Amino acid sequence: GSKTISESELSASATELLQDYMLTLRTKLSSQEIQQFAALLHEYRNGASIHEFCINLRQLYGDSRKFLLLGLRPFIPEKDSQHFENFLETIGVKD
Amino acid sequence: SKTISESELSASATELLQDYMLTLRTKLSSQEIQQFAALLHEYRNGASIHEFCINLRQLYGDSRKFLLLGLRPFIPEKDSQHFENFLETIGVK
């Protein structure tokens, strides 16, 4: 929640992954869309539920770009990871 | 503060946040660290640098003002001048 800085916010390795993920997004998303992503990640880290985060990601990315959601795994803390895997399986995205 | 700033993208800044959180343990209670965590999250989500500074000063209090200096690597360049102005105003510079 908002009162807890999560593992990925404190991990240099996860941060390297975040920076590269953002560069990767440029290939499929517009600048305005990447702004929405940033807003969504910020909302999640600020306490939005994992469900709310996932639903908003899915509607932003759309069916044709949902594969990009796999790359968010490192930013999901332990408590929310099973929910996130469930989400990925539900929308037909898998490694 | 909508964009993910250079500070949030920087592996070294993240390492320093971990280091700073370990520092906080020696000076703040768990509840106070919860307050810090919420403030950083609100700043990152959209709170102004001025709002962040004002709330941190209130949280830390006079005797822990020196800790604010450790926030430097988490403040993106765009907010740096304001942050430094704040530090000088409260006399920690």
Curated annotation (Swiss-Prot), chain A:
Localization of this protein: Cytoplasm
Top-level taxon of the source organism: Eukaryota
Family: Belongs to the CCM2 family.
Disease note: Cerebral cavernous malformations 2: A form of cerebral cavernous malformations, a congenital vascular anomaly of the central nervous system that can result in hemorrhagic stroke, seizures, recurrent headaches, and focal neurologic deficits. The lesions are characterized by grossly enlarged blood vessels consisting of a single layer of endothelium and without any intervening neural tissue, ranging in diameter from a few millimeters to several centimeters. CCM2 inheritance is autosomal dominant.
Organism whose genome encodes this protein: Homo sapiens (Human)
Swiss-Prot/TrEMBL domain comment: The C-terminal region constitutes an independently folded domain that has structural similarity with the USH1C (harmonin) N-terminus, despite very low sequence similarity.
Function: Component of the CCM signaling pathway which is a crucial regulator of heart and vessel formation and integrity. May act through the stabilization of endothelial cell junctions. May function as a scaffold protein for MAP2K3-MAP3K3 signaling. Seems to play a major role in the modulation of MAP3K3-dependent p38 activation induced by hyperosmotic shock.
Region (Harmonin homology domain): 2-95
Subunit details: Part of a complex with MAP2K3, MAP3K3 and RAC1. Binds RAC1 directly and independently of its nucleotide-bound state. Interacts with HEG1 and KRIT1; KRIT1 greatly facilitates the interaction with HEG1. Interacts with PDCD10.
Stretch of the intact protein here: 283 to 376 of 444
Name the record gives this protein: Cerebral cavernous malformations 2 protein
